[PDB]
């Protein structure tokens, strides 16, 4: 399984649009599927097909656009539980 939910919240819809435009561009360069829901000041971008290793990289890009446009991102990734236990 390899599917991630990248959701941008911000009072400026334009900041959400430029973050969006990038996260689509990133899903395209990784060659995956990209969907999005613009509704008021909430945007959820659903990137499917990209594996867990790549879904992490989309999280770094979510964060770089969050501090770029000063908007709050929240991203969901599970399947990182490769070792659902401490290193002990």
PDB file of N, CA and C in Angstrom:
ATOM      1  N   UNK A   1       0.847  -1.215   0.000  1.00  0.00           N
ATOM      2  CA  UNK A   1       0.000   0.000   0.000  1.00  0.00           C
ATOM      3  C   UNK A   1       0.881   1.264   0.000  1.00  0.00           C
ATOM      4  N   UNK A   2       0.465   2.272  -0.780  1.00  0.00           N
ATOM      5  CA  UNK A   2       1.190   3.529  -0.901  1.00  0.00           C
ATOM      6  C   UNK A   2       0.254   4.661  -1.296  1.00  0.00           C
ATOM      7  N   UNK A   3      -0.383   5.277  -0.286  1.00  0.00           N
ATOM      8  CA  UNK A   3      -1.320   6.408  -0.467  1.00  0.00           C
ATOM      9  C   UNK A   3      -1.201   7.364   0.733  1.00  0.00           C
ATOM     10  N   UNK A   4      -1.177   8.672   0.448  1.00  0.00           N
ATOM     11  CA  UNK A   4      -0.933   9.736   1.440  1.00  0.00           C
ATOM     12  C   UNK A   4      -2.001  10.836   1.312  1.00  0.00           C
ATOM     13  N   UNK A   5      -2.347  11.486   2.444  1.00  0.00           N
ATOM     14  CA  UNK A   5      -3.319  12.594   2.495  1.00  0.00           C
ATOM     15  C   UNK A   5      -2.552  13.851   2.943  1.00  0.00           C
ATOM     16  N   UNK A   6      -2.422  14.851   2.072  1.00  0.00           N
ATOM     17  CA  UNK A   6      -1.686  16.096   2.379  1.00  0.00           C
ATOM     18  C   UNK A   6      -2.684  17.249   2.373  1.00  0.00           C
ATOM     19  N   UNK A   7      -3.002  17.779   3.549  1.00  0.00           N
ATOM     20  CA  UNK A   7      -4.078  18.761   3.707  1.00  0.00           C
ATOM     21  C   UNK A   7      -3.509  20.122   4.152  1.00  0.00           C
ATOM     22  N   UNK A   8      -3.761  21.166   3.348  1.00  0.00           N
ATOM     23  CA  UNK A   8      -3.316  22.543   3.617  1.00  0.00           C
ATOM     24  C   UNK A   8      -4.510  23.381   4.115  1.00  0.00           C
ATOM     25  N   UNK A   9      -4.303  24.075   5.233  1.00  0.00           N
ATOM     26  CA  UNK A   9      -5.262  25.029   5.812  1.00  0.00           C
ATOM     27  C   UNK A   9      -4.588  26.409   5.904  1.00  0.00           C
ATOM     28  N   UNK A  10      -5.318  27.459   5.512  1.00  0.00           N
ATOM     29  CA  UNK A  10      -4.798  28.825   5.540  1.00  0.00           C
ATOM     30  C   UNK A  10      -5.855  29.841   5.141  1.00  0.00           C
ATOM     31  N   UNK A  11      -5.796  31.038   5.758  1.00  0.00           N
ATOM     32  CA  UNK A  11      -6.785  32.123   5.549  1.00  0.00           C
ATOM     33  C   UNK A  11      -6.695  32.700   4.120  1.00  0.00           C
ATOM     34  N   UNK A  12      -5.521  32.545   3.498  1.00  0.00           N
ATOM     35  CA  UNK A  12      -5.264  32.983   2.120  1.00  0.00           C
ATOM     36  C   UNK A  12      -5.369  31.769   1.186  1.00  0.00           C
ATOM     37  N   UNK A  13      -6.475  31.711   0.414  1.00  0.00           N
ATOM     38  CA  UNK A  13      -6.736  30.632  -0.558  1.00  0.00           C
ATOM     39  C   UNK A  13      -5.647  30.586  -1.648  1.00  0.00           C
ATOM     40  N   UNK A  14      -5.034  31.757  -1.943  1.00  0.00           N
ATOM     41  CA  UNK A  14      -3.961  31.852  -2.947  1.00  0.00           C
ATOM     42  C   UNK A  14      -2.723  31.053  -2.487  1.00  0.00           C
ATOM     43  N   UNK A  15      -2.380  31.161  -1.193  1.00  0.00           N
ATOM     44  CA  UNK A  15      -1.248  30.423  -0.596  1.00  0.00           C
ATOM     45  C   UNK A  15      -1.459  28.903  -0.712  1.00  0.00           C
ATOM     46  N   UNK A  16      -2.735  28.493  -0.575  1.00  0.00           N
ATOM     47  CA  UNK A  16      -3.155  27.095  -0.730  1.00  0.00           C
ATOM     48  C   UNK A  16      -3.033  26.654  -2.206  1.00  0.00           C
ATOM     49  N   UNK A  17      -3.285  27.599  -3.145  1.00  0.00           N
ATOM     50  CA  UNK A  17      -3.225  27.346  -4.609  1.00  0.00           C
ATOM     51  C   UNK A  17      -1.785  27.104  -5.101  1.00  0.00           C
ATOM     52  N   UNK A  18      -0.819  27.894  -4.590  1.00  0.00           N
ATOM     53  CA  UNK A  18       0.597  27.770  -4.998  1.00  0.00           C
ATOM     54  C   UNK A  18       1.232  26.531  -4.351  1.00  0.00           C
ATOM     55  N   UNK A  19       0.828  26.226  -3.094  1.00  0.00           N
ATOM     56  CA  UNK A  19       1.229  24.983  -2.409  1.00  0.00           C
ATOM     57  C   UNK A  19       0.696  23.761  -3.178  1.00  0.00           C
ATOM     58  N   UNK A  20      -0.594  23.841  -3.544  1.00  0.00           N
ATOM     59  CA  UNK A  20      -1.303  22.845  -4.377  1.00  0.00           C
ATOM     60  C   UNK A  20      -0.577  22.587  -5.705  1.00  0.00           C
ATOM     61  N   UNK A  21      -0.280  23.687  -6.413  1.00  0.00           N
ATOM     62  CA  UNK A  21       0.330  23.675  -7.756  1.00  0.00           C
ATOM     63  C   UNK A  21       1.674  22.942  -7.724  1.00  0.00           C
ATOM     64  N   UNK A  22       2.405  23.150  -6.622  1.00  0.00           N
ATOM     65  CA  UNK A  22       3.656  22.450  -6.355  1.00  0.00           C
ATOM     66  C   UNK A  22       3.408  20.966  -6.036  1.00  0.00           C
ATOM     67  N   UNK A  23       2.489  20.643  -5.100  1.00  0.00           N
ATOM     68  CA  UNK A  23       2.289  19.235  -4.646  1.00  0.00           C
ATOM     69  C   UNK A  23       1.772  18.318  -5.778  1.00  0.00           C
ATOM     70  N   UNK A  24       1.050  18.909  -6.752  1.00  0.00           N
ATOM     71  CA  UNK A  24       0.664  18.217  -7.994  1.00  0.00           C
ATOM     72  C   UNK A  24       1.930  17.954  -8.834  1.00  0.00           C
ATOM     73  N   UNK A  25       2.745  19.017  -9.021  1.00  0.00           N
ATOM     74  CA  UNK A  25       4.044  18.970  -9.745  1.00  0.00           C
ATOM     75  C   UNK A  25       4.976  17.877  -9.173  1.00  0.00           C
ATOM     76  N   UNK A  26       4.950  17.712  -7.835  1.00  0.00           N
ATOM     77  CA  UNK A  26       5.811  16.741  -7.143  1.00  0.00           C
ATOM     78  C   UNK A  26       5.275  15.314  -7.370  1.00  0.00           C
ATOM     79  N   UNK A  27       3.943  15.154  -7.279  1.00  0.00           N
ATOM     80  CA  UNK A  27       3.267  13.869  -7.566  1.00  0.00           C
ATOM     81  C   UNK A  27       3.490  13.434  -9.032  1.00  0.00           C
ATOM     82  N   UNK A  28       3.634  14.432  -9.925  1.00  0.00           N
ATOM     83  CA  UNK A  28       3.887  14.210 -11.361  1.00  0.00           C
ATOM     84  C   UNK A  28       5.348  13.776 -11.615  1.00  0.00           C
ATOM     85  N   UNK A  29       6.317  14.393 -10.892  1.00  0.00           N
ATOM     86  CA  UNK A  29       7.758  14.087 -11.083  1.00  0.00           C
ATOM     87  C   UNK A  29       8.090  12.683 -10.521  1.00  0.00           C
ATOM     88  N   UNK A  30       7.365  12.290  -9.452  1.00  0.00           N
ATOM     89  CA  UNK A  30       7.460  10.945  -8.851  1.00  0.00           C
ATOM     90  C   UNK A  30       6.632   9.913  -9.640  1.00  0.00           C
ATOM     91  N   UNK A  31       5.852  10.408 -10.624  1.00  0.00           N
ATOM     92  CA  UNK A  31       4.958   9.606 -11.471  1.00  0.00           C
ATOM     93  C   UNK A  31       3.951   8.797 -10.627  1.00  0.00           C
ATOM     94  N   UNK A  32       2.947   9.516 -10.118  1.00  0.00           N
ATOM     95  CA  UNK A  32       1.869   8.941  -9.324  1.00  0.00           C
ATOM     96  C   UNK A  32       0.537   9.593  -9.655  1.00  0.00           C
ATOM     97  N   UNK A  33      -0.493   9.279  -8.867  1.00  0.00           N
ATOM     98  CA  UNK A  33      -1.845   9.815  -9.046  1.00  0.00           C
ATOM     99  C   UNK A  33      -2.041  10.968  -8.047  1.00  0.00           C
ATOM    100  N   UNK A  34      -2.704  12.059  -8.464  1.00  0.00           N
ATOM    101  CA  UNK A  34      -2.930  13.232  -7.606  1.00  0.00           C
ATOM    102  C   UNK A  34      -4.381  13.741  -7.773  1.00  0.00           C
ATOM    103  N   UNK A  35      -5.053  13.913  -6.634  1.00  0.00           N
ATOM    104  CA  UNK A  35      -6.429  14.432  -6.533  1.00  0.00           C
ATOM    105  C   UNK A  35      -6.420  15.551  -5.474  1.00  0.00           C
ATOM    106  N   UNK A  36      -7.393  16.480  -5.511  1.00  0.00           N
ATOM    107  CA  UNK A  36      -7.481  17.569  -4.509  1.00  0.00           C
ATOM    108  C   UNK A  36      -8.921  18.086  -4.343  1.00  0.00           C
ATOM    109  N   UNK A  37      -9.229  18.579  -3.126  1.00  0.00           N
ATOM    110  CA  UNK A  37     -10.536  19.174  -2.795  1.00  0.00           C
ATOM    111  C   UNK A  37     -10.350  20.592  -2.203  1.00  0.00           C
ATOM    112  N   UNK A  38     -10.555  21.624  -3.046  1.00  0.00           N
ATOM    113  CA  UNK A  38     -10.579  23.040  -2.615  1.00  0.00           C
ATOM    114  C   UNK A  38     -11.986  23.387  -2.115  1.00  0.00           C
ATOM    115  N   UNK A  39     -12.122  23.625  -0.805  1.00  0.00           N
ATOM    116  CA  UNK A  39     -13.414  23.953  -0.184  1.00  0.00           C
ATOM    117  C   UNK A  39     -13.188  25.007   0.918  1.00  0.00           C
ATOM    118  N   UNK A  40     -13.396  26.287   0.548  1.00  0.00           N
ATOM    119  CA  UNK A  40     -13.222  27.425   1.450  1.00  0.00           C
ATOM    120  C   UNK A  40     -11.757  27.732   1.737  1.00  0.00           C
ATOM    121  N   UNK A  41     -11.283  27.319   2.921  1.00  0.00           N
ATOM    122  CA  UNK A  41      -9.888  27.516   3.370  1.00  0.00           C
ATOM    123  C   UNK A  41      -9.258  26.172   3.759  1.00  0.00           C
ATOM    124  N   UNK A  42      -9.922  25.074   3.362  1.00  0.00           N
ATOM    125  CA  UNK A  42      -9.427  23.700   3.568  1.00  0.00           C
ATOM    126  C   UNK A  42      -9.198  23.043   2.193  1.00  0.00           C
ATOM    127  N   UNK A  43      -8.007  22.474   2.019  1.00  0.00           N
ATOM    128  CA  UNK A  43      -7.583  21.763   0.804  1.00  0.00           C
ATOM    129  C   UNK A  43      -6.993  20.415   1.213  1.00  0.00           C
ATOM    130  N   UNK A  44      -7.522  19.285   0.702  1.00  0.00           N
ATOM    131  CA  UNK A  44      -6.861  17.963   0.885  1.00  0.00           C
ATOM    132  C   UNK A  44      -6.467  17.355  -0.473  1.00  0.00           C
ATOM    133  N   UNK A  45      -5.154  17.210  -0.639  1.00  0.00           N
ATOM    134  CA  UNK A  45      -4.496  16.615  -1.811  1.00  0.00           C
ATOM    135  C   UNK A  45      -4.211  15.120  -1.531  1.00  0.00           C
ATOM    136  N   UNK A  46      -4.829  14.212  -2.295  1.00  0.00           N
ATOM    137  CA  UNK A  46      -4.672  12.762  -2.095  1.00  0.00           C
ATOM    138  C   UNK A  46      -3.743  12.216  -3.185  1.00  0.00           C
ATOM    139  N   UNK A  47      -2.510  11.857  -2.797  1.00  0.00           N
ATOM    140  CA  UNK A  47      -1.496  11.324  -3.725  1.00  0.00           C
ATOM    141  C   UNK A  47      -1.386   9.799  -3.535  1.00  0.00           C
ATOM    142  N   UNK A  48      -1.780   9.055  -4.575  1.00  0.00           N
ATOM    143  CA  UNK A  48      -1.914   7.590  -4.555  1.00  0.00           C
ATOM    144  C   UNK A  48      -0.831   6.943  -5.448  1.00  0.00           C
ATOM    145  N   UNK A  49      -0.448   5.693  -5.122  1.00  0.00           N
ATOM    146  CA  UNK A  49       0.492   4.905  -5.930  1.00  0.00           C
ATOM    147  C   UNK A  49       1.941   5.059  -5.497  1.00  0.00           C
ATOM    148  N   UNK A  50       2.309   6.263  -5.034  1.00  0.00           N
ATOM    149  CA  UNK A  50       3.661   6.548  -4.537  1.00  0.00           C
ATOM    150  C   UNK A  50       3.934   5.735  -3.232  1.00  0.00           C
ATOM    151  N   UNK A  51       5.054   4.937  -3.163  1.00  0.00           N
ATOM    152  CA  UNK A  51       5.370   4.087  -1.975  1.00  0.00           C
ATOM    153  C   UNK A  51       5.752   4.913  -0.731  1.00  0.00           C
ATOM    154  N   UNK A  52       5.862   4.233   0.435  1.00  0.00           N
ATOM    155  CA  UNK A  52       6.084   4.880   1.749  1.00  0.00           C
ATOM    156  C   UNK A  52       7.339   5.782   1.745  1.00  0.00           C
ATOM    157  N   UNK A  53       8.437   5.282   1.147  1.00  0.00           N
ATOM    158  CA  UNK A  53       9.698   6.046   0.984  1.00  0.00           C
ATOM    159  C   UNK A  53       9.470   7.421   0.295  1.00  0.00           C
ATOM    160  N   UNK A  54       8.604   7.433  -0.730  1.00  0.00           N
ATOM    161  CA  UNK A  54       8.289   8.639  -1.516  1.00  0.00           C
ATOM    162  C   UNK A  54       7.283   9.538  -0.765  1.00  0.00           C
ATOM    163  N   UNK A  55       6.331   8.907  -0.054  1.00  0.00           N
ATOM    164  CA  UNK A  55       5.289   9.612   0.733  1.00  0.00           C
ATOM    165  C   UNK A  55       5.921  10.493   1.825  1.00  0.00           C
ATOM    166  N   UNK A  56       7.067  10.033   2.359  1.00  0.00           N
ATOM    167  CA  UNK A  56       7.886  10.827   3.288  1.00  0.00           C
ATOM    168  C   UNK A  56       8.383  12.106   2.604  1.00  0.00           C
ATOM    169  N   UNK A  57       8.871  11.966   1.365  1.00  0.00           N
ATOM    170  CA  UNK A  57       9.451  13.084   0.594  1.00  0.00           C
ATOM    171  C   UNK A  57       8.384  14.156   0.281  1.00  0.00           C
ATOM    172  N   UNK A  58       7.138  13.697   0.007  1.00  0.00           N
ATOM    173  CA  UNK A  58       5.971  14.595  -0.148  1.00  0.00           C
ATOM    174  C   UNK A  58       5.670  15.354   1.168  1.00  0.00           C
ATOM    175  N   UNK A  59       5.984  14.733   2.318  1.00  0.00           N
ATOM    176  CA  UNK A  59       5.805  15.359   3.639  1.00  0.00           C
ATOM    177  C   UNK A  59       6.816  16.494   3.862  1.00  0.00           C
ATOM    178  N   UNK A  60       8.075  16.293   3.406  1.00  0.00           N
ATOM    179  CA  UNK A  60       9.133  17.336   3.484  1.00  0.00           C
ATOM    180  C   UNK A  60       8.741  18.543   2.613  1.00  0.00           C
ATOM    181  N   UNK A  61       8.136  18.250   1.445  1.00  0.00           N
ATOM    182  CA  UNK A  61       7.698  19.278   0.486  1.00  0.00           C
ATOM    183  C   UNK A  61       6.430  19.990   0.981  1.00  0.00           C
ATOM    184  N   UNK A  62       5.563  19.246   1.677  1.00  0.00           N
ATOM    185  CA  UNK A  62       4.388  19.810   2.363  1.00  0.00           C
ATOM    186  C   UNK A  62       4.819  20.874   3.396  1.00  0.00           C
ATOM    187  N   UNK A  63       5.880  20.532   4.150  1.00  0.00           N
ATOM    188  CA  UNK A  63       6.454  21.386   5.199  1.00  0.00           C
ATOM    189  C   UNK A  63       7.204  22.604   4.619  1.00  0.00           C
ATOM    190  N   UNK A  64       7.908  22.423   3.475  1.00  0.00           N
ATOM    191  CA  UNK A  64       8.678  23.525   2.858  1.00  0.00           C
ATOM    192  C   UNK A  64       7.724  24.593   2.296  1.00  0.00           C
ATOM    193  N   UNK A  65       6.539  24.144   1.820  1.00  0.00           N
ATOM    194  CA  UNK A  65       5.477  25.042   1.316  1.00  0.00           C
ATOM    195  C   UNK A  65       4.677  25.657   2.476  1.00  0.00           C
ATOM    196  N   UNK A  66       4.609  24.932   3.603  1.00  0.00           N
ATOM    197  CA  UNK A  66       3.954  25.423   4.826  1.00  0.00           C
ATOM    198  C   UNK A  66       4.685  26.656   5.391  1.00  0.00           C
ATOM    199  N   UNK A  67       6.027  26.572   5.478  1.00  0.00           N
ATOM    200  CA  UNK A  67       6.871  27.686   5.966  1.00  0.00           C
ATOM    201  C   UNK A  67       7.114  28.740   4.860  1.00  0.00           C
ATOM    202  N   UNK A  68       6.911  28.344   3.584  1.00  0.00           N
ATOM    203  CA  UNK A  68       7.043  29.254   2.424  1.00  0.00           C
ATOM    204  C   UNK A  68       5.886  30.265   2.421  1.00  0.00           C
ATOM    205  N   UNK A  69       4.660  29.726   2.466  1.00  0.00           N
ATOM    206  CA  UNK A  69       3.420  30.511   2.345  1.00  0.00           C
ATOM    207  C   UNK A  69       2.796  30.802   3.729  1.00  0.00           C
ATOM    208  N   UNK A  70       3.513  30.402   4.805  1.00  0.00           N
ATOM    209  CA  UNK A  70       3.125  30.635   6.226  1.00  0.00           C
ATOM    210  C   UNK A  70       1.717  30.052   6.540  1.00  0.00           C
ATOM    211  N   UNK A  71       1.414  28.920   5.881  1.00  0.00           N
ATOM    212  CA  UNK A  71       0.144  28.176   6.047  1.00  0.00           C
ATOM    213  C   UNK A  71       0.394  26.871   6.822  1.00  0.00           C
ATOM    214  N   UNK A  72      -0.647  26.362   7.487  1.00  0.00           N
ATOM    215  CA  UNK A  72      -0.561  25.151   8.314  1.00  0.00           C
ATOM    216  C   UNK A  72      -0.877  23.909   7.479  1.00  0.00           C
ATOM    217  N   UNK A  73       0.103  23.006   7.320  1.00  0.00           N
ATOM    218  CA  UNK A  73      -0.132  21.702   6.669  1.00  0.00           C
ATOM    219  C   UNK A  73      -0.273  20.601   7.737  1.00  0.00           C
ATOM    220  N   UNK A  74      -1.095  19.612   7.429  1.00  0.00           N
ATOM    221  CA  UNK A  74      -1.232  18.390   8.205  1.00  0.00           C
ATOM    222  C   UNK A  74      -1.274  17.228   7.210  1.00  0.00           C
ATOM    223  N   UNK A  75      -0.375  16.258   7.393  1.00  0.00           N
ATOM    224  CA  UNK A  75      -0.228  15.133   6.456  1.00  0.00           C
ATOM    225  C   UNK A  75      -0.354  13.805   7.201  1.00  0.00           C
ATOM    226  N   UNK A  76      -0.981  12.827   6.543  1.00  0.00           N
ATOM    227  CA  UNK A  76      -1.198  11.498   7.096  1.00  0.00           C
ATOM    228  C   UNK A  76      -0.384  10.476   6.286  1.00  0.00           C
ATOM    229  N   UNK A  77       0.499   9.742   6.981  1.00  0.00           N
ATOM    230  CA  UNK A  77       1.251   8.610   6.419  1.00  0.00           C
ATOM    231  C   UNK A  77       1.294   7.477   7.455  1.00  0.00           C
ATOM    232  N   UNK A  78       0.742   6.308   7.088  1.00  0.00           N
ATOM    233  CA  UNK A  78       0.899   5.068   7.865  1.00  0.00           C
ATOM    234  C   UNK A  78       1.402   3.950   6.939  1.00  0.00           C
ATOM    235  N   UNK A  79       2.042   2.943   7.538  1.00  0.00           N
ATOM    236  CA  UNK A  79       2.860   1.981   6.792  1.00  0.00           C
ATOM    237  C   UNK A  79       4.344   2.198   7.073  1.00  0.00           C
ATOM    238  N   UNK A  80       4.638   3.285   7.832  1.00  0.00           N
ATOM    239  CA  UNK A  80       5.961   3.532   8.421  1.00  0.00           C
ATOM    240  C   UNK A  80       6.198   2.594   9.622  1.00  0.00           C
ATOM    241  N   UNK A  81       5.161   1.803   9.988  1.00  0.00           N
ATOM    242  CA  UNK A  81       5.207   0.813  11.081  1.00  0.00           C
ATOM    243  C   UNK A  81       5.917  -0.498  10.644  1.00  0.00           C
ATOM    244  N   UNK A  82       6.976  -0.352   9.810  1.00  0.00           N
ATOM    245  CA  UNK A  82       7.849  -1.458   9.342  1.00  0.00           C
ATOM    246  C   UNK A  82       8.385  -2.276  10.534  1.00  0.00           C
ATOM    247  N   UNK A  83       8.660  -1.545  11.621  1.00  0.00           N
ATOM    248  CA  UNK A  83       9.162  -2.084  12.881  1.00  0.00           C
ATOM    249  C   UNK A  83       8.344  -1.410  13.992  1.00  0.00           C
ATOM    250  N   UNK A  84       7.064  -1.840  14.132  1.00  0.00           N
ATOM    251  CA  UNK A  84       6.103  -1.256  15.097  1.00  0.00           C
ATOM    252  C   UNK A  84       6.427  -1.709  16.541  1.00  0.00           C
ATOM    253  N   UNK A  85       7.558  -1.191  17.011  1.00  0.00           N
ATOM    254  CA  UNK A  85       8.277  -1.631  18.211  1.00  0.00           C
ATOM    255  C   UNK A  85       9.557  -0.788  18.267  1.00  0.00           C
ATOM    256  N   UNK A  86      10.098  -0.531  19.467  1.00  0.00           N
ATOM    257  CA  UNK A  86      11.371   0.215  19.598  1.00  0.00           C
ATOM    258  C   UNK A  86      12.555  -0.576  19.000  1.00  0.00           C
ATOM    259  N   UNK A  87      13.727   0.067  18.925  1.00  0.00           N
ATOM    260  CA  UNK A  87      14.990  -0.598  18.512  1.00  0.00           C
ATOM    261  C   UNK A  87      15.611  -1.351  19.714  1.00  0.00           C
ATOM    262  N   UNK A  88      14.749  -2.162  20.349  1.00  0.00           N
ATOM    263  CA  UNK A  88      14.998  -2.902  21.587  1.00  0.00           C
ATOM    264  C   UNK A  88      13.697  -3.678  21.922  1.00  0.00           C
TER     265      UNK A  88
END
